[PDB]
Structures are given as structure tokens and as C-alpha cells.
Amino acid sequence: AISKNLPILKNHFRKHWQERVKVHFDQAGKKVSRRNARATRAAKIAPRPLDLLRPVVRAPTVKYNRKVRAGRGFTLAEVKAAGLTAAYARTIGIAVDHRRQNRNQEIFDANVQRLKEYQSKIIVFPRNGKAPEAEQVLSAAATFPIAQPATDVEARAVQDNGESAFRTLRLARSEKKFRGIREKRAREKAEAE
Amino acid sequence: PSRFTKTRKHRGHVSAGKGRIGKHRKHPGGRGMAGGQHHHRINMDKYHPGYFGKVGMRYFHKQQAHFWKPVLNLDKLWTLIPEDKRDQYLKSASKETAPVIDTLAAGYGKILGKGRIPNVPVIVKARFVSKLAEEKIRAAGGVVELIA
Amino acid sequence: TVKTGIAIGLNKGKKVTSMTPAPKISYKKGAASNRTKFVRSLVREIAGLSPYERRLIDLIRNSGEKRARKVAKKRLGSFTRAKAKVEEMNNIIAASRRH
Amino acid sequence: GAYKYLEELQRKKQSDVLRFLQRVRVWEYRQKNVIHRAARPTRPDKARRLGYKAKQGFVIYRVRVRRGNRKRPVPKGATYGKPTNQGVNELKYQRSLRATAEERVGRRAANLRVLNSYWVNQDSTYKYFEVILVDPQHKAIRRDARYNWICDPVHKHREARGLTATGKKSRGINKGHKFNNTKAGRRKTWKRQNTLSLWRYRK
Amino acid sequence: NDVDPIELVVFLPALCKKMGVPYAIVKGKARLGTLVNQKTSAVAALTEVRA
RNA sequence: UUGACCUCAAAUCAGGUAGGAGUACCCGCUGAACUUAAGCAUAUCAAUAAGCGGAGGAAAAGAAACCAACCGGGAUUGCCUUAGUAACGGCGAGUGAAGCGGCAAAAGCUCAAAUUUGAAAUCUGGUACCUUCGGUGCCCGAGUUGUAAUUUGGAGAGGG
RNA sequence: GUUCUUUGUAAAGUGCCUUCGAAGAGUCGAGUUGUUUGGGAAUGCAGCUCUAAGUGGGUGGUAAAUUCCAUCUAAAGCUAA
Ligand SMILES: [K+]
Ligand SMILES: [K+]
Ligand SMILES: [Mg+2]
Ligand SMILES: [Mg+2]
Ligand SMILES: [Mg+2]
Ligand SMILES: [Mg+2]
Ligand SMILES: [Mg+2]
Ligand SMILES: [Mg+2]
Ligand SMILES: [Mg+2]
Ligand SMILES: [Mg+2]
Ligand SMILES: [Mg+2]
Ligand SMILES: [Mg+2]
Ligand SMILES: [Mg+2]
Ligand SMILES: [Mg+2]
Ligand SMILES: [Mg+2]
Ligand SMILES: [Mg+2]
Ligand SMILES: [Mg+2]
Ligand SMILES: [Mg+2]
Ligand SMILES: [Mg+2]
Ligand SMILES: [Mg+2]
Ligand SMILES: [Mg+2]
Ligand SMILES: [Mg+2]
Ligand SMILES: [Mg+2]
Ligand SMILES: [Mg+2]
Ligand SMILES: [Mg+2]
Ligand SMILES: [Mg+2]
């Protein structure tokens, strides 16, 4: 069944594929149900914003390390520097991630800053008090947006020192390539009988 | 839709456009890519040379994010500047207060040198640059600042 | 180990201000633990050697550490485990009569 | 306490003392029934590690399981298929002898819930296991919030569904690239990968 | 002397010998249980004694 | 001779519990061949049908012996992607994931290994009463071959 | 929301110094066999043989020796959407 000039196709339908066909007829019904569940959860929970405050965090994998995004939870170091304990932050609506570590002062500072902003912008009700109705806002993420850090200014002075960036890249690659060979060569030339 | 198909037109015509001698049988040449080396060899070698065999070396667990490096040619190099600022940067082509372009922020990994840019200094920040791209930037009076 | 600030080469990557996070208590899962050192020493005293450990000691004393390490790599899984076991065995030998 | 010494000593299985105890105990277990109630754990430290507590409601059962491969039960070795399936004698039963032990013990004590099990002995013919079971009807277990989770009906015959330690191991339930086939369930992953997803607005 | 899984006490003479603690292997976990108001005790120690 | 202990029994002993049905979905075991390869044996169909064991309202998974190699992410699940790609394959027919990224939902934790040792502080049951999904007193019993409190690696403990 | 209950010199959290810091074995791992996987000098699983350690152990998708580095912390457990 190889006819005239057409691309080779790879349609994987040699199993009983018709027994597993998910047609999402319930896309609209599920959207309605999700909105209903969000409304019911908002009504059920305290005048609390339906989601926890998340940290700012650098994406891995240089394809994405140029950008910043919401992480799972604030590190223990970040919570301590913001002046809370992990248990109390979890009770007042802060996501806490024991797994994440701080090796970047800029990200650590941004997270401590947004923790301080959140603490200043929330009102914690007393356990046995009155705390008059505080007009629940639904999105901590919308209240505290994640902002991409500004790396440079719009305009600057040209400072070409004659380094030839292409040559710099070539030399860095070559030096990495021949680092081990040169180290072995120096090791063998350090014989000194 | 069905009312526009040729099968409506074949109603009343016995063979349904499939012929009397060679009918519409089930799989006369085999199923799928059967016989690519034996009875479909001509249609394989023509229109698909190179199909059979191996051509290089394998790469277990290859991740495409390692090789992510979108290329931007010098021919644009200025669509990265917002349109309104572009005119006032093109005018007054000054060595001082030259526009800084973060091509990595724009989503590019290497700057190539296809086109030609105006004689306006630009500070091009990039992970990688083509040799000709860097020389053209320098000839326009700008600089390439390597970033990561 | 500071990044070079460029996208290729040995210490490639962006320069950021480092922080040196506090050491996790994990990364100390296989630590010294005086208590377990005592327990392991006492158990090694009360229960003696395994047959392969005795064979390894004989091989160390008679055929050399290389042959002993070959047999230890056969008995255990890996060469690193064989080396550690032979080191433990000749430490046992040293702690034995030939002080 | 003594449990650290027990744990370290139990690892010297080829020492003289443990070899002697192995021989005597394997003879005794072989003389007893294939499945029989054990008065107390033979390895109290291991039982504690696996979740046993010395309170009313916790039960220990010793079970003997035949060793070796799973011979294909086809008559006269005839498989009536392609030669790739003609094998009879080197087929391996993708489930542990420990799992067989817990399943048989759970069928015996169906009023209990298999919490765990551990190896105690073996000979050429048999492998010997002690199964820790919990009585979900006993009030000491229904109270004691540390253990009344096993009283929930969702935990009926967890050993039969592969929810014990050996069951999760055999099902391949672990994290990482080595368990891509079996992380969320092998058949569930296969269904998800072999499902054709069609949206209202086709993509 | 009759601890049925004996590993619970096999290390005890050597532990006592290494720590310089006088020890006696004695007949009866049941007897030690009578000592300490239990059915069986498997050990019984004196740390302080009256003058 | 008496009283224990250990192990093992018996009772229409006191009180309970299992089985069977259903089985769309779910967790496992076992397990084809038709079929495709224009023949066919590996392969494919398919880790499917049939067979067997076991649940729930969901199940399973689940708080990393993870992913990564980054300026690092951070339980699990699902969707959109990655991708018909890396890879597998009489490298033939065919097969074929995963990391990242956007999103839905978000939630975290607990035992073992510790001397309470100036006090088994723990628990089932019986019985009487009570404000009865239970409580209190008393009594047996379980339990030191370890039941409570205390700690779970993010730590944490002991002293000051 | 309102009332009789008030637990309790009980419980919990936090700063600094100091001594420690127990962390799961016929298991991990290895060989071999079978099955399986996209996992390719071997992806998982299972049988049998061997069988660990504690600055260890696992992983790091090409087998191996050597030197490092990174990242987790198995062989026990619960958990809604
Ligand atoms: K034809
Ligand atoms: K058959
Ligand atoms: Mg006609
Ligand atoms: Mg006709
Ligand atoms: Mg003809
Ligand atoms: Mg009992
Ligand atoms: Mg068999
Ligand atoms: Mg009765
Ligand atoms: Mg049933
Ligand atoms: Mg068919
Ligand atoms: Mg055919
Ligand atoms: Mg045909
Ligand atoms: Mg035929
Ligand atoms: Mg079926
Ligand atoms: Mg039901
Ligand atoms: Mg649900
Ligand atoms: Mg569940
Ligand atoms: Mg953990
Ligand atoms: Mg994740
Ligand atoms: Mg594409
Ligand atoms: Mg397949
Ligand atoms: Mg505390
Ligand atoms: Mg562990
Ligand atoms: Mg099979
Ligand atoms: Mg676990
Ligand atoms: Mg579970």
C-alpha cells in the first residue's frame, strides 16, 4: 500500500483504539462544575483567597532559566528571614516548601520581600474575636503578581574593548575541550625524573 | 459534507468509480508500508530516497532543551526594540545612550548575521553570536555583550 | 567555581549572588553515630566471621590483596564493596595477633 | 535498647550463631503446618520496624511457600501458539514468594488485615515468612488513631491488591525514570498513553 | 536462660563483660517475672541497693 | 505435693469478623490467537480478549533513595504540550516514552531505631452506675520478648 | 451570635551556647535465567546463586578502572482535590 508521492505517515491505530477514545463532550460541563466548586470552596473557607501565596522562583533548563515563575512554596530560610515559623505560615496561607534551597540571593530577597508584603497586606482574624467582615478577595496570585526582574536599562554607552565576543566563545569552548588533555600533559611533564 | 461527494454521483453506476476489471478489493498491495523493499521499491527509492538503513550515531535520553538556541538574524535586530522607541533610537545614532537589546529575553539564543543593519550603535546582549553578526554590529558601532 | 557569565566553557552560566544554604540533616544519613559504632563492634565480637570473610582473610595472608580483592568482588556485588571489605579484613588481621 | 543489637546481629546470617539458629528454626517451622499462628514475632525488632506493636489486635502468622519458578500449568507442556510462547520451565511469576505468603495468610485470617511481612528462613524447597496482621475489629485498633486507618474498608485485602511493601515493589511503584512504565500503575499508564483524546474543537 | 528467641539476650553476657557489669545467667524468665510482678521478665537488674 | 511459665489445644464458652452478589470505572495475577508483516519463525495484534484474586465512591498514586545539570526546580494525579520525537525494531512491518513549559487541583505528614526508670505513665474485656457512636469507679486480663508520653531527618534530642 | 463552662502556674512556639544526632538486611547491590520496557553491554518485575556498607547507600539512560562533582535518603507507613 505504498502509492504516489506522499509523506510517510505514522498513524498508530493498529490496536483496539476505538475502545479508548476520550471525546471531551463534558468540556463545558466540567468548566461549569469547576466554577461551581471554586465558588463553593470560596464560600466554605474563611474570607481567604482560595489559594496560597507562592514564591518567585527561577525555572531550570536554560531554555527557561531566562524567566521567573511561581514555585511550590517558600523555603524554610525565606520564612525565617521573613520572621515567621513554617507552621504558622502554613496556617495563615503561605505555601512552605522544605525541599527547595536558597543558593541565589536575588531570588531569596524577592521571596522575603513578597512574604513581608503579604504579611502587611493580610489581616489575621483573632481565634476568639470579632474581626469584622473583611471582604474576601479570591486570588493571592492576582494580589501579588510575579514580576520578571529587570536585568538592564533601556540605553547605555557602548564599551567595546576589542575582545571579539565570537572569539571569546570560541576560546572558551576550545579551552573546555582541551582542559583534560592539557592537565594530563602537565601531569606527565611534571615527572622531574 | 456528504451531499457534495462523488459517491452521490456514483449512485446508479455499478462499480462506484472503482472499475470493472480491477475492482475495489481489500488490500491488493499489502497493508501500510508493506513491500517497501520488494514490490513498492520504485515508489520508495523515488520520492523517498534514504528511507532504509541507519545514517548516524544514537543519542540515548536526548533532551531538546539542551539544544534550545533560537536564531535571530541581524536583518531584523530592531523588531526587538518597541516600535515607538525605534524611531528615536534610529535617529541620533549615538555611541552614548545606545539601545540595549536583550535577545535572550526576547527568546533567542544565537545572533546570526544575514541582513545588514543601519549605522546605529546597539548593545546586543546574546548567549552566542555569529562571527559576521558581531563584525557587522561593531561596524555599525555597537558591541556584543555575552550573557548566560 | 564562580560562573564565568557566558553560555559556553568550563564554568559557564550566569553569575548570581551565592547563599550557601544551611546543611540538611539528610546528607548525614550514613554518619558515624558512636552508638552504632559500639553496637557494630560488639556484634562483630560476638558473631565472628562469615565463611567468605574467613576465605578472604586466608587469601590476604597467603595469596595477596589483589587475589583477595578478586574473590571479594566475586562474592559481593562491586569492586568498591570488594575494596572496602578487603580493607576491613586486613584491619581485622592487624587487630588480630600481628598487632 | 536491645533492638539495635537485634538489627545488627540479624545481618550476620552466615555467622556461627545465626547459622545454628537458622538450622534449628527451619527444622521446627518445617515440622509445623504450612500456615500456622506464631505466638510472638521471631524477630521483634523487624516486626516493630514493619509496624507491629505488642498489643491486642496484632497477630503474627508463619507461612511456608514453595521456592522456584512458576511452571506453566499447560497440559503436557503444549502451549498451542507461536514459539515465542512455547516456554514452560523458566517462567518467573512476576510477584514475590513473600506476596504469595501474605495472600495465603490473609485468605486464612480474612477477618484481619495484612499490615506487613518479613523473611525468617529458607531451605531449598521452602521460603519462610512471618506475616504481621492487624485486627480491624479490635477496639484497641479502632481507637489508637495511629492504626485505625487500616480499619477503613479501602484497605480490605491490601496484600491481594498489592498494597503492602512487597506488593508495591512488585508493582514497580517508585519514583523516577526507571519506573516510567509503572509509576501510577502500569495498566493505568498504558491506558492513558493509548487513549485518543478528542476535544470539541479538534486540535 | 530460656528466652525463646535467644537473640534478645545472646549479646547480653558480652555487653555486660565489655561494660564491666557483673552478670549471671539464671534459670527462669518465669522466676524473673515473679521478681518483677510479671509472667516473664527475661532480665532483672539491680542499679542501686540499700546500705 | 502445690503454684507459676512457655508452647499447644477444646468448648453450641463472651463478643465479633470473612465468604456471596455487583463488577462501568479501579488494584493486581495470568494470558492467547485471529490479525499485520502482502509468505513466515523475532516482531505485531498486546504487556489486549478470555481466565483468577481484591476495593471504593472513586480507586490507585502521593509528600522524592524525584527531576535535573539550570540563575536550578520541588508530593501525587489529570489536561495541553513535549511527540509520532529520543529510543526500540527480521532498523522490516511496526512501535515509542520522559525532563522542562502553560494549566486544573493543591496538603500535608508518622512510625522503627532513645532509660518513664523517682514509679506501664498504656490498652481490650467484665461488672455497677451514668448525661450511652461514649464516660466514670471497681475487677480480671494484655503488656517489660515493651503498651503510653517524647523525636521522624524539613530535623530533632539531652543539658545551660 | 448568646450563655454555664476555664482549661492550666498544663500544653505549644521562638533566641543563644554546648554534647549529640539512634534513621528499616537475605535487603541494597551483583551474576545468571525468564519476562517485560522506548530503555539501547540489559527499563521494570520475578526465580536461583552470591550477598554489603555507614564521610555509607541510590541515581546521574554506553560496558569498565581511576579521580571528582551533583542530587536525593531505599529496603516501614497514612493522606482530600
Ligand atoms: K486495482
Ligand atoms: K495459546
Ligand atoms: Mg460510466
Ligand atoms: Mg463489480
Ligand atoms: Mg487483471
Ligand atoms: Mg496476644
Ligand atoms: Mg513454583
Ligand atoms: Mg460462643
Ligand atoms: Mg467477593
Ligand atoms: Mg481484528
Ligand atoms: Mg502475514
Ligand atoms: Mg495477505
Ligand atoms: Mg498464513
Ligand atoms: Mg478480562
Ligand atoms: Mg460499596
Ligand atoms: Mg473525585
Ligand atoms: Mg487511597
Ligand atoms: Mg521525607
Ligand atoms: Mg512534581
Ligand atoms: Mg512537531
Ligand atoms: Mg507495545
Ligand atoms: Mg515537642
Ligand atoms: Mg529509611
Ligand atoms: Mg507474563
Ligand atoms: Mg515511602
Ligand atoms: Mg497508600
Signed CA dihedral, D148, D151, D152, D158: sign only: positive
User: Measured between alpha carbons, how far is C66 from C83 in angstroms, rounded to an integer?
Assistant: 10
The three state secondary structure string of chain B is CHHHCHHHHCCCCCCCCCCCCCCCCCCCCCCCCCCCCCCCHHHHHCCCCCCCCCCCCCCCCCCHHHHCCCEEECCCCCCCCCHHHHHHHHCCCCCCCEEEEEHHHHCCCEEECCCCCCCCCCEEEECEECHHHHHHHHHCCCEEEECC
What is the least distance, in Å, from the CA of C10 to any CA of chain A?
5
With contact defined as beta carbons under 8 Å apart, do D79 and D133 qualify?
A: no
Number of other residues whose CB lies within 10 A of the CB of residue B37: 12
Give the residue from A61, A102, A62, A56 showing the smallest Cα distance to A81. A102
User: Measured between alpha carbons, how far is D117 from D46 in angstroms, rounded to an integer?
Assistant: 9
Q: How many alpha carbons lie under 13 Å from residue B40 in its C-beta half-sphere?
A: 21
With contact defined as beta carbons under 8 Å apart, do A123 and B62 qualify?
A: no
User: Measured between alpha carbons, how far is A49 from A141 in angstroms, rounded to an integer?
Assistant: 9
Query: Buried b / exposed e across A145-171, counting CB within 10 Å, b at 16+?
Result: ebeeeeeeeebeebebeeebbbebbee
Residue-by-residue DSSP string for D166-179: HHHHHHT---SGGG
With contact defined as beta carbons under 8 Å apart, do D151 and D141 qualify?
A: yes
What is the least distance, in Å, from the CA of D45 to any CA of chain C?
15
Number of other residues whose CB lies within 10 A of the CB of residue A111: 27
Give the residue from B137, B145, B78 showing the smallest Cα distance to B113. B137
Give the residue from A54, A50, A53, A52 showing the smallest Cα distance to A35. A50
Q: For nucleotide F100, give the residue with the nearest CA to its C1'.
A: A61
Domain C16-99 architecture: Orthogonal Bundle (1.10)
With contact defined as beta carbons under 8 Å apart, do A178 and B148 qualify?
A: no
A184 vs A27, A80, D105, CA distance in Å? 63, 47, 63
User: Measured between alpha carbons, how far is A82 from A111 in angstroms, rounded to an integer?
Assistant: 9
Signed CA dihedral, D14, D18, D21, D26: sign only: negative
User: Measured between alpha carbons, how far is B19 from B30 in angstroms, rounded to an integer?
Assistant: 20
C61 vs C51, C54, C67, C68, C89, CA distance in Å? 15, 11, 10, 9, 10
Number of other residues whose CB lies within 10 A of the CB of residue D82: 7
Q: Chains near E, with 3+ CB pairs < 8 A?
A: C, D
Is B127 in contact with C7 (Cβ distance < 8 A)? yes
Torsion angle of the four alpha carbons B6, B7, B13, B16, in this order, in degrees rounded to the nearest 10: 100
Side chain identity at D151, as an amino acid letter?
C
Give the residue from D61, D50, D59, D55 showing the smallest Cα distance to D140. D55
Query: Buried b / exposed e across B96-119, counting CB within 10 Å, b at 16+?
Result: eebbbbbbbbeebbbbbbeeebee
User: Measured between alpha carbons, how far is A75 from A98 in angstroms, rounded to an integer?
Assistant: 6
Residue-by-residue DSSP string for chain A: ---SS-PPP-----S-GGGSEEE-TTHHHHHHHHHHHHHHHHHHS-S--SS-B--EEE-STTTSTTSEEE-S-B-HHHHHHHT--HHHHHHTTB-B-SS-----HHHHHHHHHHHHHHHHH--PPPTTS--------S-HHHHS---PPP-S-SEE-----S--HHHHHHHHHHHHHHHHHHHHHHHHHT---
Q: A178: which 3 cell numbers?
A: 582541551
Q: A109: which 3 cell numbers?
A: 530577597
Q: Chains near D, with 3+ CB pairs < 8 A?
A: A, C, E
Element (H, E) at C51: helix C51-62
A34 vs A28, A29, C95, D172, D201, CA distance in Å? 10, 9, 71, 33, 20
User: Measured between alpha carbons, how far is A67 from A69 in angstroms, rounded to an integer?
Assistant: 7
- Partners of residue A62 in chain C, C-beta under 8 Å: 7
User: Measured between alpha carbons, how far is A66 from B106 in angstroms, rounded to an integer?
Assistant: 10
User: Measured between alpha carbons, how far is A53 from A115 in angstroms, rounded to an integer?
Assistant: 8
Number of other residues whose CB lies within 10 A of the CB of residue D60: 21
Please give the angle made by the CA atoms of D94, D99 and D103, to the nearest 5 degrees: 125
Give the residue from B105, B113, B109 showing the smallest Cα distance to B77. B113
CATH number of the domain enclosing D194: 3.40.1120.10
User: Measured between alpha carbons, how far is B84 from D151 in angstroms, rounded to an integer?
Assistant: 70
SS3 for D151? helix
Q: A174: which 3 cell numbers?
A: 576550545
**C78 Cβ neighbours under 8 A, 6+ residues apart:** none
**C44 Cβ neighbours under 8 A, 6+ residues apart:** none
Is C51 in contact with D14 (Cβ distance < 8 A)? yes
Q: How far is it between the farthest Cα atoms of chain E?
A: 37
Q: Could you state, in order of their start, the residue ranges of all structural domains in chain C?
A: 16-99
Q: D161: which 3 cell numbers?
A: 491488591
Angle between helices C51-62 and C65-75 (to 10 degrees): 160
Side chain identity at C11, as an amino acid letter?
N
Among chain D residues, CA nearest to E14: D5
With contact defined as beta carbons under 8 Å apart, do D117 and D104 qualify?
A: no
Please give the angle made by the CA atoms of B8, B9 and B12, to the nearest 5 degrees: 95
B34 vs A7, B31, B44, CA distance in Å? 15, 6, 11
User: Measured between alpha carbons, how far is B119 from A98 in angstroms, rounded to an integer?
Assistant: 53
Q: B48: which 3 cell numbers?
A: 523517498
Bridge partners (DSSP) of residue D59 are D133
Give the residue from B78, B139, B87, B88 showing the smallest Cα distance to B111. B78
C25 vs A163, B84, B133, C31, D123, CA distance in Å? 46, 55, 51, 10, 42
User: Measured between alpha carbons, how far is B24 from A22 in angstroms, rounded to an integer?
Assistant: 33
SS3 for D119? strand
**D26 Cβ neighbours under 8 A, 6+ residues apart:** D121, D122, D123, D128
Q: What is the DSSP letter of C5?
A: S
* β-pair type (D196-198, A21-23): parallel
Resolution in angstroms for this experimental structure?
Answer: 2.0
Residue that is written with C-alpha cell 564599551 in the block: A159
User: Measured between alpha carbons, how far is D138 from D151 in angstroms, rounded to an integer?
Assistant: 10
How far is residue B133 CA from its own chain's centroid?
20
The three state secondary structure string of A57-72 is EECCCCCCCCCEEECC
Residues 2-31 of E with CB under 8 A from C: 10-11, 14-15, 18
**C6 Cβ neighbours under 8 A, 6+ residues apart:** A168, A169, A172, B127, B146, B147, B148, C12
Q: What is the DSSP letter of D77?
A: G
Q: D196: which 3 cell numbers?
A: 485518543
Q: C33: which 3 cell numbers?
A: 553515630
Number of other residues whose CB lies within 10 A of the CB of residue B139: 11
SS3 for C94? helix
User: Measured between alpha carbons, how far is D137 from B68 in angstroms, rounded to an integer?
Assistant: 60
User: Measured between alpha carbons, how far is C74 from B67 in angstroms, rounded to an integer?
Assistant: 42
Give the residue from D120, D122, D118, D130 showing the smallest Cα distance to D166. D118
**Count of the separate structural domains present in chain D:** 1
Residue-by-residue DSSP string for D41-64: -SSHHHHHHTT--SSTTEEEEEEE
A172 in contact with nucleic chain F (CB within 7 A) = no
A108 vs A90, A111, B2, B78, C53, CA distance in Å? 19, 5, 63, 35, 52
The answer to whether residue B90 neighbours chain A at the CB level (below 8 Å) is: no
The answer to whether residue B139 neighbours chain A at the CB level (below 8 Å) is: no
A147 vs A151, A186, C96, CA distance in Å? 12, 49, 68
